[PDB]
Design a protein around this ligand. Sequence first.
Ligand SMILES: NC(=O)c1ccc[n+]([C@@H]2O[C@H](COP(=O)([O-])OP(=O)(O)OC[C@H]3O[C@@H](n4cnc5c(N)ncnc54)[C@H](O)[C@@H]3O)[C@@H](O)[C@H]2O)c1
Ligand SMILES: NC(=O)c1ccc[n+]([C@@H]2O[C@H](COP(=O)([O-])OP(=O)(O)OC[C@H]3O[C@@H](n4cnc5c(N)ncnc54)[C@H](O)[C@@H]3O)[C@@H](O)[C@H]2O)c1
Ligand SMILES: NC(=O)c1ccc[n+]([C@@H]2O[C@H](COP(=O)([O-])OP(=O)(O)OC[C@H]3O[C@@H](n4cnc5c(N)ncnc54)[C@H](O)[C@@H]3O)[C@@H](O)[C@H]2O)c1
Ligand SMILES: NC(=O)c1ccc[n+]([C@@H]2O[C@H](COP(=O)([O-])OP(=O)(O)OC[C@H]3O[C@@H](n4cnc5c(N)ncnc54)[C@H](O)[C@@H]3O)[C@@H](O)[C@H]2O)c1
Ligand SMILES: O=C(c1ccc(F)c(O)c1)c1cccc(-c2ccc(O)c(O)c2)n1
Ligand SMILES: O=C(c1ccc(F)c(O)c1)c1cccc(-c2ccc(O)c(O)c2)n1
Ligand SMILES: O=C(c1ccc(F)c(O)c1)c1cccc(-c2ccc(O)c(O)c2)n1
Ligand SMILES: O=C(c1ccc(F)c(O)c1)c1cccc(-c2ccc(O)c(O)c2)n1
Ligand SMILES: OC[C@H]1O[C@@H](O)[C@H](O)[C@@H](O)[C@@H]1O
Ligand SMILES: OC[C@H]1O[C@@H](O)[C@H](O)[C@@H](O)[C@@H]1O
Ligand SMILES: OC[C@H]1O[C@@H](O)[C@H](O)[C@@H](O)[C@@H]1O
Ligand SMILES: OC[C@H]1O[C@@H](O)[C@H](O)[C@@H](O)[C@@H]1O
Ligand code: NA
Ligand code: NA
Ligand code: NA
Ligand code: NA
Lengths: 253, 253, 253, 253
Amino acid sequence: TRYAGKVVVVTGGGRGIGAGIVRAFVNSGARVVICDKDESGGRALEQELPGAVFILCDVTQEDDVKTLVSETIRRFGRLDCVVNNAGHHPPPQRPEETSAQGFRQLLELNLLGTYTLTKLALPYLRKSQGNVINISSLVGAIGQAQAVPYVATKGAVTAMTKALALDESPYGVRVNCISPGNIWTPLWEELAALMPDPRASIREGMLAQPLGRMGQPAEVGAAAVFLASEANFCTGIELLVTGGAELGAGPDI
Amino acid sequence: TRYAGKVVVVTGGGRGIGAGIVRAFVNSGARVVICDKDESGGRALEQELPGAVFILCDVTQEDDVKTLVSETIRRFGRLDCVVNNAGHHPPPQRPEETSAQGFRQLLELNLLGTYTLTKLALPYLRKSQGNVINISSLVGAIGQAQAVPYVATKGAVTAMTKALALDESPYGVRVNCISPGNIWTPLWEELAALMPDPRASIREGMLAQPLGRMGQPAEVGAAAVFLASEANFCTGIELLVTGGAELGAGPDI
Amino acid sequence: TRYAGKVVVVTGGGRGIGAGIVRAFVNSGARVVICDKDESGGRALEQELPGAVFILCDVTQEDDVKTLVSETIRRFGRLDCVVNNAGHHPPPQRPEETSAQGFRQLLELNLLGTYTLTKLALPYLRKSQGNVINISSLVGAIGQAQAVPYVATKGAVTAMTKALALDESPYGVRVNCISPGNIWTPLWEELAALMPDPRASIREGMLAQPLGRMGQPAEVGAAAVFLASEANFCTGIELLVTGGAELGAGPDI
Amino acid sequence: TRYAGKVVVVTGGGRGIGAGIVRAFVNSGARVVICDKDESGGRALEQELPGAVFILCDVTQEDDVKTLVSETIRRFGRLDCVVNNAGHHPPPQRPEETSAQGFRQLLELNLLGTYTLTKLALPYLRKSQGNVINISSLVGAIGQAQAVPYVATKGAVTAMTKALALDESPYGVRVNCISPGNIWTPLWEELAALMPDPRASIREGMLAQPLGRMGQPAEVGAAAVFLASEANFCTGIELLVTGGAELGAGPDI
Ligand SMILES: NC(=O)c1ccc[n+]([C@@H]2O[C@H](COP(=O)([O-])OP(=O)(O)OC[C@H]3O[C@@H](n4cnc5c(N)ncnc54)[C@H](O)[C@@H]3O)[C@@H](O)[C@H]2O)c1
Ligand SMILES: NC(=O)c1ccc[n+]([C@@H]2O[C@H](COP(=O)([O-])OP(=O)(O)OC[C@H]3O[C@@H](n4cnc5c(N)ncnc54)[C@H](O)[C@@H]3O)[C@@H](O)[C@H]2O)c1
Ligand SMILES: NC(=O)c1ccc[n+]([C@@H]2O[C@H](COP(=O)([O-])OP(=O)(O)OC[C@H]3O[C@@H](n4cnc5c(N)ncnc54)[C@H](O)[C@@H]3O)[C@@H](O)[C@H]2O)c1
Ligand SMILES: NC(=O)c1ccc[n+]([C@@H]2O[C@H](COP(=O)([O-])OP(=O)(O)OC[C@H]3O[C@@H](n4cnc5c(N)ncnc54)[C@H](O)[C@@H]3O)[C@@H](O)[C@H]2O)c1
Ligand SMILES: O=C(c1ccc(F)c(O)c1)c1cccc(-c2ccc(O)c(O)c2)n1
Ligand SMILES: O=C(c1ccc(F)c(O)c1)c1cccc(-c2ccc(O)c(O)c2)n1
Ligand SMILES: O=C(c1ccc(F)c(O)c1)c1cccc(-c2ccc(O)c(O)c2)n1
Ligand SMILES: O=C(c1ccc(F)c(O)c1)c1cccc(-c2ccc(O)c(O)c2)n1
Ligand SMILES: OC[C@H]1O[C@@H](O)[C@H](O)[C@@H](O)[C@@H]1O
Ligand SMILES: OC[C@H]1O[C@@H](O)[C@H](O)[C@@H](O)[C@@H]1O
Ligand SMILES: OC[C@H]1O[C@@H](O)[C@H](O)[C@@H](O)[C@@H]1O
Ligand SMILES: OC[C@H]1O[C@@H](O)[C@H](O)[C@@H](O)[C@@H]1O
Ligand code: NA
Ligand code: NA
Ligand code: NA
Ligand code: NA
């Protein structure tokens, strides 16, 4: 009942972290709108969870997002929280192998899709004194190898979170982000499968955290529910869900 | 029921943030041991709250702390979480008005008291896969005027949190901190009363946050319960509960 | 003579911070290529400074940048340092007054222009064990009011700096950034002139720093020369040139 | 000539980073007072370097420090910069192997010695519009294994730097710190020699940096000269000289 009576939109909610966030909000008593560009996972989740429904929506298509918001309001009569989780990590790429056009396309998804839904949702969030949760990444803060475009997009999301927190503070709308580290999701599994040694890349991913394992979608979900339902004096924070990866370490010429 | 069956020690739990933390843990289903050097607030809280008991203990006195731990185990049979909240902010002091001996004394409370309880509690926390929550401060990260010793002690607590998180990660014990900004507590009220213009110092404290108010003990308490009960992939984090104070801003010769 | 015999490209070098950086490198003994989209300032600077020459180049036009690099190599035979300074701050804009297309255009300049020159320069920087200096902003780290797109672009630049530092470390090329705070430049003067009270906006800008004044282009320039010529164990750093603005601060319901 | 006519005190200047800082300041045209508790290195350095002299002084002994300052003024007539470099890293120690009394003693050196010299020097630094440079550590920010007391002391130094920067900004005295990562010094060599596999511990230390080597005292020295002589808009910064160690990384149950 921590978030009973509230209405939440989760983008990219059909699998992975997004689905974990959907589940956590349903378990907290909220009604959830699952947005995803793919039907498969989200439609099954809508059948599985009373309290969750699925709306097909590509966050890079402004008219899809306009309809996402208007359908949420039409069906449920309020909007309390948007979780901007949709995003992608390309395969590892050397800097000289990247392109400006590929960088633009990744910005469209990871940055501008978050921007667009937030903009369209804010009038309703102001009415409900709701909140925005962006899913950024630890690597925006510390960097990552073979990922210049991805890292740049997440540095942008974290910074944008802080700017919007300032702008929306007078209107009572909090804006926060979660920066996960390695979370075991279908994206992680897919990228590992491309590696020459998949099992070795997964073991290395597990051992990059002092806790010795990767995180779970449910753990990101719990952080999101905390930010939405109980963090009333938190705005513009970056909540790290990383297992300690940023900590510690891992002749002079 | 989020922390049902668990046993929590809160130092400086008799008033202010500590009492808010006590209340939040009792509301989560835990049994709480209130430690304080003063009897007045903590004894009343023990009468008020089923599930909370009071133990007189000055965290700067190693034998008091040894007894705190041994009595917790004797009475409740386990220990799951220590919240190191006891601490003090001296009145504003110009750097030249400070002394090495005053700095040592503040270190004893704000830093070494946290160190001592954590050390004595860790064997029991390892058995329960429990966790440590230190109450640091935003000003350890960003500085504060007229507070060199206090700021130094909180920079130490935040850093110590990260070091111990690394050391205890193989044993399954998470170590995190909360960095509050301005929280309205009896300490805040006491320090304001010393100012030449108390009401103006309070209004200025409220307006230092984009959210336009100070925080509440209950809000720090909710963050603590999250860290203890649901943040299983978080270790060595600094969770900001500051209302946005670190954000934003507030001819060349 | 700290950077004698070296060749440096400074984008947006015709006025403001960029011109200060140009001057600092010429004073260190380097030859400098001033890149700017406008002729006026850069052409005068080329006449003023022996050791500096001007090349017209819009960093958002890939073919301009290709020619910038090839002409630098043709005329001077090596490339040791690129300073990605070209960028813009739009007038203050409420979030609901921004557009996705305006955000894309600002990304093109502030982010992708930096990306494009760096990419085209890196083969030559590897040959010379040279280095990249990106001019980001403090507000990427702490946020700024009425500047969602700008803040996002600078969060991206800072993060990209760290990612590329990782990727180029095996090749001996350091990648760092400078995050200035308020620096008195023609852009600052132009934006202030649009405010209803220009003198009050300037005074407020001066007082946002503990040092009580805005910074100078020459001070950013000195930081750049340090990063290029003497910071041989620094890569992926964010060097703050802000006058202390990020420090300090400036009933519970 | 970057710091010609200026007078600098370097604590722990007899070997290691401190000696590198001494050399860098002498090469910049300054007169340097080498403070150390041991005679051997500092006395030889005084004979080696015109412009440097040695004063025996244990920074934990207030009367030694009072004499250090008064002798500097008596002999050279001004004081422009104090570099608080004296400090120690104990051998790796598990948290349960530490003691409160050992922690107090390390605080005395690493924290209170810095505090004491700064306090005694500030009246003279105000007259000269001089500056303070504290040598902290990267591990204050990110943690380190088997080093709870050391990490805490350096978190304190970094935070204290920011607090004092705020307090001294109205008086025109800048206060900054340098956070080195692994620098090859006699302390590093001594600690490695205690390890079961010294050569393997050194190789591991080298590889903890993306740059693939440890840093040199001269590189910390160059950063110090920059902070003293050319960073006139920098106060309260933490200048990282770490080779990139804080960057990057190095199934869900
Ligand atoms: N997995 C990790 O380790 C990790 C770590 C840090 C941050 N993140 C971030 O978490 C988020 C989720 O990552 P994940 O690992 O769960 O990925 P995932 O690929 O497993 O799931 C992403 C989901 O988003 C959907 N999606 C993608 N593009 C979309 C679009 N245009 N419109 C709508 N939906 C779209 C996908 O269809 C999918 O269901 C991303 O923002 C990612 O950058 C992930
Ligand atoms: N109030 C704020 O704005 C604020 C902001 C950031 C951090 N903090 C931190 O939060 C903590 C609590 O602050 P508060 O404002 O609630 O203070 P408070 O003075 O209102 O309450 C502190 C409590 O700790 C107890 N205590 C003090 N010394 C003790 C000792 N030696 N042993 C045991 N108990 C002892 C006191 O008796 C009191 O009940 C402190 O660590 C403080 O540094 C406070
Ligand atoms: N002034 C500040 O307070 C401040 C603070 C932090 C960061 N910055 C950053 O410093 C940089 C310089 O800012 P400034 O205040 O000197 O600005 P400015 O407007 O005074 O100077 C910018 C220069 O860049 C040139 N430029 C713009 N677009 C270009 C393009 N497409 N190609 C080539 N040149 C182009 C302009 O013609 C001009 O000469 C920017 O990246 C800005 O974001 C400025
Ligand atoms: N070496 C590294 O990798 C490293 C990394 C980060 C930070 N640091 C910091 O840099 C500083 C220097 O470290 P180092 O590796 O050069 O050490 P070092 O042991 O090689 O040299 C330290 C010097 O300080 C002197 N000293 C020690 N205690 C003193 C006292 N009480 N009074 C006066 N002088 C005293 C010693 O006699 C010695 O000459 C320390 O503050 C250390 O914490 C070192
Ligand atoms: O999506 C991934 C990811 C991993 C960590 C993150 F913090 C994040 O935001 C995203 C992921 C999954 C599997 C492998 C990789 C990866 C592996 C090697 C790389 O060089 C790389 O850039 C990414 N990234
Ligand atoms: O205890 C206080 C406090 C305030 C903010 C904090 F983040 C914190 O950790 C502690 C407090 C309460 C009331 C006034 C003050 C205060 C006012 C002016 C000062 O110059 C100062 O250093 C502290 N501090
Ligand atoms: O270009 C500016 C700037 C200012 C500070 C920065 F750190 C930065 O990167 C850029 C600037 C200059 C003059 C006024 C402003 C400004 C004033 C009010 C605002 O609301 C705003 O977003 C920006 N910015
Ligand atoms: O003094 C050392 C040091 C190393 C890195 C630092 F950033 C620092 O401030 C100090 C040092 C030198 C040699 C070995 C070690 C060391 C090795 C293993 C450890 O577990 C440990 O805590 C320290 N530290
Ligand atoms: O595919 C990797 C993992 O993805 C997660 O989102 C699912 O919850 C897990 O069942 C699965 O093992
Ligand atoms: O004294 C200031 C405040 O302290 C808090 O700890 C109490 O919960 C409030 O009732 C009180 O107003
Ligand atoms: O226009 C503001 C300032 O811009 C700087 O770049 C110039 O160096 C100054 O002469 C001028 O006052
Ligand atoms: O002992 C390790 C290193 O210490 C440094 O301070 C010296 O400059 C080097 O000559 C020596 O190799
Ligand atoms: Na459903
Ligand atoms: Na009770
Ligand atoms: Na010229
Ligand atoms: Na000499």
